[PDB]
Design a protein around this ligand. Structure first.
Ligand SMILES: CC(C)CN(C[C@H]1CNC[C@@H]1COCc1ccccc1)S(=O)(=O)c1ccccc1
Lengths: 99, 99
């Protein structure tokens, strides 16, 4: 599809068998998810921006379905108010910027 | 143009007679640039960031040329990890996400 920027580019995603809202974010290197449980081990990480840094847990090889497209890769889980789909998964689903 | 996301979508911008590199950030509501002087009136503004709000300077109706596309709008100047072009100006140059 083609997603407008008049509003935040929020789309529905599915992870596990859970459906959520997430932001398609070209400014984010990584995908950041709101606090949730995932199985397996993780690595500690710190990620920052305007304002500073939050502590997150890095899981690898996580499936996120985005508008029917299955992306598999690293996700960072922590105290974000919004699920953020970053370039590591946007590339997989063939997402481009166009103007 | 069409911009893929395997790398950061950093582009050259011309603002206030100066050439800069900035990140095209669909996740950003607003455009935020590193410390620089710009002509005209500005007001202090607080913006929501990681773990809290940050003080920026707000300059309205500023011309900026992105990839050869002209935008005229609000630019915030303050402590950002990188120059980011947010939806306020991305909408003006016709930017959408596609997959
Ligand atoms: C929450 C906000 C202050 C973070 N920044 C913008 C958001 C919007 N797209 C990238 C970043 C989200 O993903 C980054 C992120 C980092 C830590 C916690 C959540 C999200 S930013 O301007 O600081 C920034 C822009 C570009 C790259 C990195 C940061």
């Amino acid at each position: 599809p083609q997603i407008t920027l008049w509003q935040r580019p929020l789309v529905t995603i599915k992870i596990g068998g859970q459906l959520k809202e997430a932001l398609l974010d070209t400014g984010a290197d990584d995908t950041v998810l709101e606090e949730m449980s995932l199985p397996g081990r993780w690595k500690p990480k710190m990620i920052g921006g305007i304002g500073g840094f939050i502590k997150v847990r890095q899981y690898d090889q996580i499936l996120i379905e985005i508008c029917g497209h299955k992306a598999i890769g690293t996700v960072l889980v922590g105290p974000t108010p919004v699920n953020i789909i970053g370039r590591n998964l946007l590339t997989q689903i063939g997402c481009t910027l166009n103007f």
